[PDB]
Amino acid sequence: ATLDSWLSNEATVARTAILNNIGADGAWVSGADSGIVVASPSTDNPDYFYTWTRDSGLVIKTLVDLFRNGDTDLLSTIEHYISSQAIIQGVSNPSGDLSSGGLGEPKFNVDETAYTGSWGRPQRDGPALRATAMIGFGQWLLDNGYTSAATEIVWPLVRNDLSYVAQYWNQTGYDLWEEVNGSSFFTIAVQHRALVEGSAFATAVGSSCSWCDSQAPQILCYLQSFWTGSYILANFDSSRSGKDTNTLLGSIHTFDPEAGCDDSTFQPCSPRALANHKEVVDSFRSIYTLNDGLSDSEAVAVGRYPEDSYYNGNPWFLCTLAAAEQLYDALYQWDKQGSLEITDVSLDFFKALYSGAATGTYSSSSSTYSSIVSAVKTFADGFVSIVETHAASNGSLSEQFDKSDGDELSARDLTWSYAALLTANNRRNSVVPPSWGETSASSVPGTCAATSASGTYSSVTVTSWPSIVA
Ligand SMILES: *[C@@H]1O[C@H](CO)[C@@H](O[C@@H]2O[C@H](CO)[C@@H](O[C@@H]3O[C@H](CO[C@H]4O[C@H](CO)[C@@H](O)[C@H](O[C@H]5O[C@H](CO)[C@@H](O)[C@H](O)[C@@H]5O)[C@@H]4O)[C@@H](O)[C@H](O[C@H]4O[C@H](CO)[C@@H](O)[C@H](O)[C@@H]4O[C@H]4O[C@H](CO)[C@@H](O)[C@H](O)[C@@H]4O[C@H]4O[C@H](CO)[C@@H](O)[C@H](O)[C@@H]4O)[C@@H]3O)[C@H](O)[C@H]2NC(C)=O)[C@H](O)[C@H]1NC(C)=O
Ligand SMILES: *[C@@H]1O[C@H](CO)[C@@H](O[C@@H]2O[C@H](CO)[C@@H](O[C@@H]3O[C@H](CO)[C@@H](O)[C@H](O[C@H]4O[C@H](CO)[C@@H](O)[C@H](O)[C@@H]4O[C@H]4O[C@H](CO)[C@@H](O)[C@H](O)[C@@H]4O)[C@@H]3O)[C@H](O)[C@H]2NC(C)=O)[C@H](O)[C@H]1NC(C)=O
Ligand SMILES: *[C@H]1O[C@H](CO)[C@@H](O)[C@H](O)[C@@H]1O
Ligand SMILES: *[C@H]1O[C@H](CO)[C@@H](O)[C@H](O)[C@@H]1O
Ligand SMILES: *[C@H]1O[C@H](CO)[C@@H](O)[C@H](O)[C@@H]1O
Ligand SMILES: *[C@H]1O[C@H](CO)[C@@H](O)[C@H](O)[C@@H]1O
Ligand SMILES: *[C@H]1O[C@H](CO)[C@@H](O)[C@H](O)[C@@H]1O
Ligand SMILES: *[C@H]1O[C@H](CO)[C@@H](O)[C@H](O)[C@@H]1O
Ligand SMILES: *[C@H]1O[C@H](CO)[C@@H](O)[C@H](O)[C@@H]1O
Ligand SMILES: *[C@H]1O[C@H](CO)[C@@H](O)[C@H](O)[C@@H]1O
Ligand SMILES: *[C@H]1O[C@H](CO)[C@@H](O)[C@H](O)[C@@H]1O
Ligand SMILES: *[C@H]1O[C@H](CO)[C@@H](O)[C@H](O)[C@@H]1O
């Protein structure tokens, strides 16, 4: 009633607010070059008036999925993005140059110049997210007969990013929250995905990605160590508990609708991902006043990690939305498989929502199934309701909402907040992204090796774009 209605409305605001934060015509970010996704129009306290490789990557992947589903008007946005990245790849910055680490730089000025101050650099997820975003578009181009655009523009750009991933996966760097210098789940996860899809894309254009093939399996091997037996460790080399929404994002951004509940890939329905979901959400239940009085079968306001002090440590729109997207993903998966399984690892997740939960396999026509899925759906919607309750009356989504009063704080009109809304809504509606080949990339090697593979670097020049019609 309320929710379905607010969601449809919000999806429209979310799409518009995103376009507003992209240069060089975006109404809120005058100054940004063409195809430059700005984190937020906020230039002071905090200053988010910059472009991050991760942020743009996530946003554009969302735009490509909408485009592929019929939002044909986004073509020019996507093209401008690709053109801008051809340039960014080549900008010399504190992380290096194209072939010497430059690709790992977290952010840049909106005018495409380097950000020279001190920053937690590099962030190795960047290159992986950008490649994933471009491959999505490249696939479309191949399908609609624009072979040249795909082979000559997209592939070469992707090849650079894939080379960086294969070369440095096994080195520490900063996490997505830009604070912990170590080895992070989200990064490893998204890096594994990029090499797999990168390899298939290379073959599709009549080329190859040898470095994608040898490293993918090794990245997967390494990923297995993040499981502690109870939850997914967010980062190695950290002194925190390790419970972080970082792990929810890694699962949802690597969700493959063709996958079963694979533990090796931390799929949304995997017993390990469900157990983790419970550990992570529960960690915020007693630390936010906003969560006072809700029981364990009720949705709560979710933050990044329980130890967060940023602006005092508050719930985040995107974190709360991720908690719900993982559930929508799992519902979809169970629905396609036609059954759901409860194991000892995931019993606690299930039991908190359906007290008669017991291990076993439940077909989709069973009473237990019916009872579990209704409860999960209601819990997932609960998180979305929290968002809706704290959004501004006109739909504006901020970075955070106050731990005590629910007021919006930190960066205003955060692009990422809007993209997280769009994807949660899509999933809720059974609108899933194209598969990335998880069904042929979930096998763990017998022994993990600390290794790398050196690919190849070459500067791309985007002279012109063919007259593409959608
Ligand atoms: C729903 O309704 C909302 C309520 O109205 C609406 O939000 C409002 O949106 C307008 C824009 O449409 C925002 O206006 C901007 O306000 C800036 C000042 O903000 C501070 O002070 C305000 C007033 O007291 C506060 O309310 C405001 O708080 C908000 O932001 C906080 C921080 O993120 C947040 O924590 C709070 O919770 C709250 O959300 C904040 O404290 C003002 O600076 C800005 O002016 C720029 O833009 C104008 C045009 O857009 C230009 O004319 C002007 O000259 C400024 O341009 C400079 O900055 C731009 C980027 O923002 C660049 O593009 C320009 O090139 C230029 O940049 C130069 O200067 C920079 C200086 O540092 C430099 O870095 C650059 O490199 C360059 O040299 C503008 O007036 C208003 O703040 C919003 N209000 C609220 C409450 O959020 C919302 O959008 C609606 N949503 C939807 C979905 O429709
Ligand atoms: C490059 O690749 C290699 C090969 O894949 C990576 O090497 C693997 O590294 C992992 C992590 O060190 C390692 O697993 C550890 O094995 C120990 C036993 O042999 C465990 O004692 C250790 O436990 C920690 O992590 C557990 C989760 O697996 C937690 O349950 C446990 O509490 C420990 O976690 C705490 O302590 C760590 C210290 O490791 C701390 O940083 C955490 O934040 C937390 O506080 C691990 O399970 C594998 O043995 C290694 N594999 C091989 C073949 O050597 C290497 O790490 C990669 N390097 C980079 C930078 O990418
Ligand atoms: C993930 O992919 C592996 C192969 O690499 C399968 O064996 C597994 O069943 C899942 O599909
Ligand atoms: C499944 O496939 C992986 C990927 O190559 C192998 O390394 C593994 O040993 C298993 O056969
Ligand atoms: C890292 O190590 C692997 C296996 O030990 C090598 O095959 C690889 O080429 C790199 O040296
Ligand atoms: C990645 O780093 C390895 C070391 O594990 C080198 O052997 C390889 O050549 C590449 O530079
Ligand atoms: C890894 O190493 C190879 C071979 O030295 C280079 O060609 C590549 O650019 C990267 O530095
Ligand atoms: C690595 O490989 C690419 C593609 O073959 C070359 O163009 C590049 O110069 C480097 O040799
Ligand atoms: C490496 O490859 C890029 C992309 O084809 C070229 O632009 C460059 O000239 C070099 O051959
Ligand atoms: C590839 O890199 C060169 C710099 O070496 C740029 O001039 C080009 O625009 C592209 O970014
Ligand atoms: C794309 O191509 C131009 C030459 O046409 C180079 O200057 C640029 O560095 C990139 O290789
Ligand atoms: C302009 O230059 C680039 C790189 O040299 C080509 O890829 C493009 O087709 C046009 O000739």
Q: Over the chain, what HEC string results?
A: CHHHHHHHHHHHHHHHHHHHCECCCCCCCCCCCCCCECCCCCCCCCCCCCEEHHHHHHHHHHHHHHHHCCCHHHHHHHHHHHHHHHHHHHCCECCECCCCCHHHCCEECCCCCECCCCCCCCCCHHHHHHHHHHHHHHHHHHHCCCHHHHHHHHHHHHHHHHHHHHHHCCCCEECCCCCCEEEEHHHHHHHHHHHHHHHHHHHHCCCCCHHHHHHHHHHHHHHHHHECCCCECCEECCCCCCCCCHHHHHHHCCCCCCCCCCCCCCCCCCHHHHHHHHHHHHCCCCCCHHHCCCCCCCCCCCCCCCCCCHHHCCCEHHHHHHHHHHHHHHHHHHHHHCEEEECCCCHHHHHCCCCCCCCEEEECCCHHHHHHHHHHHHHHHHHHHHHHHHCCCCCCCCCEECCCCCCEECCCCCHHHHHHHHHHHHHHCCCCCCCCCHHHCCCCCCCCCCCCCCCCCCCCCCCCCCCCCC
Cα dist from 449 to 167, 216, 221, 275, whole Å: 14, 12, 8, 28
Q: Tell me, in Å, the resolution of the deposited structure.
A: 2.4
Compute the distance from residue 183 Cα to the ligand 2 centre, in Å: 10
Residue minimizing CA distance to atom 6 of ligand 10: 90
Q: Which residues contact 43 (CB under 8 A, 6 or more apart)?
A: 49
Chain center to CA of 65: 13
Q: Please tell me the distance from the alpha carbon of residue 174 to that of residue 135, in angstroms, as a whole number.
A: 25
* Tokens 């900008």 belong to residue: 91
Compute the distance from residue 88 Cα to the ligand 11 centre, in Å: 13
Q: Please tell me the distance from the alpha carbon of residue 176 to that of residue 234, in angstroms, as a whole number.
A: 10
Compute the distance from residue 461 Cα to the ligand 12 centre, in Å: 6
Residue minimizing CA distance to atom 6 of ligand 12: 463
Residue minimizing CA distance to atom 11 of ligand 11: 459
Residue 178 among the catalytic residues: yes
Q: Are 73 and 84 in contact (CB under 8 A)?
A: no
Does the Cβ of 217 fall within 6 Å of ligand 4? Answer: yes
Compute the distance from residue 232 Cα to the ligand 3 centre, in Å: 21
Task: Work out which ligand 9 atom sits closest to the CA atom of 457.
Answer: 1
Compute the distance from residue 262 Cα to the ligand 4 centre, in Å: 15
Q: Please tell me the distance from the alpha carbon of residue 322 to that of residue 192, in angstroms, as a whole number.
A: 20
Compute the distance from residue 303 Cα to the ligand 11 centre, in Å: 44
Does the Cβ of 452 fall within 6 Å of ligand 6? Answer: yes
Does the Cβ of 152 fall within 6 Å of ligand 12? Answer: yes
Set 55, 105, 125, 175: catalytic member: 175
Nearest 10 degrees: Cα torsion 155, 161, 166, 171: 180
Ligand (nearest to CA of 436)? 3
What are the φ and ψ backbone dihedral angles of 403, each rounded to 5 degrees?
Answer: -60, -25
Does the Cβ of 394 fall within 6 Å of ligand 12? Answer: no
Which residues fall in the annotated binding site? 119
Tokens of 2: 């309320």
Which residues fall in the annotated binding site for substrate? 119
Amino acid of residue 303:
G
362 pairs with which residues across the strands? Answer: 340
Does the Cβ of 83 fall within 6 Å of ligand 6? Answer: no
Residue minimizing CA distance to atom 4 of ligand 7: 454
Domain ranges of the chain: 1-470
Q: Are 451 and 218 in contact (CB under 8 A)?
A: yes
Q: Are 235 and 176 in contact (CB under 8 A)?
A: no
Ligand (nearest to CA of 459)? 10
Q: Please tell me the distance from the alpha carbon of residue 35 to that of residue 420, in angstroms, as a whole number.
A: 20
Q: Strands 107-108, 51-52: parallel, antiparallel or unpaired by DSSP? A: antiparallel
Q: Please tell me the distance from the alpha carbon of residue 197 to that of residue 165, in angstroms, as a whole number.
A: 13
Residue 175 among the catalytic residues: yes
Q: Which residues contact 317 (CB under 8 A, 6 or more apart)?
A: 387, 390, 391, 397, 398, 399, 400, 401, 414, 417, 420, 421
Does the Cβ of 97 fall within 6 Å of ligand 7? Answer: no
Q: How was this structure determined?
A: X-ray
Q: Please tell me the distance from the alpha carbon of residue 209 to that of residue 195, in angstroms, as a whole number.
A: 8
Q: Strands 360-363, 51-52: parallel, antiparallel or unpaired by DSSP? A: unpaired
Q: Give the orientation angle of helix 75-90 with respect to helix 53-68, to 10 degrees.
A: 150
Q: Which of 83, 89, 154, 463 to mutate to test the pocket of ligand 12 (most atoms within 8 A of CB)?
A: 463
How many other C-beta atoms lie within 10 A of the C-beta of residue 367? 9
Does the Cβ of 452 fall within 6 Å of ligand 7? Answer: no
Nearest 10 degrees: Cα torsion 55, 61, 67, 68: 180
Tokens of 33: 């070059």
Residue minimizing CA distance to atom 2 of ligand 10: 90
Architecture of domain 1-470: Alpha/alpha barrel (1.50)
Q: Please tell me the distance from the alpha carbon of residue 203 to that of residue 26, in angstroms, as a whole number.
A: 36
Q: Which of 325, 305, 323 is nearest to 314 (CA)?
A: 305
Residue minimizing CA distance to atom 1 of ligand 6: 452
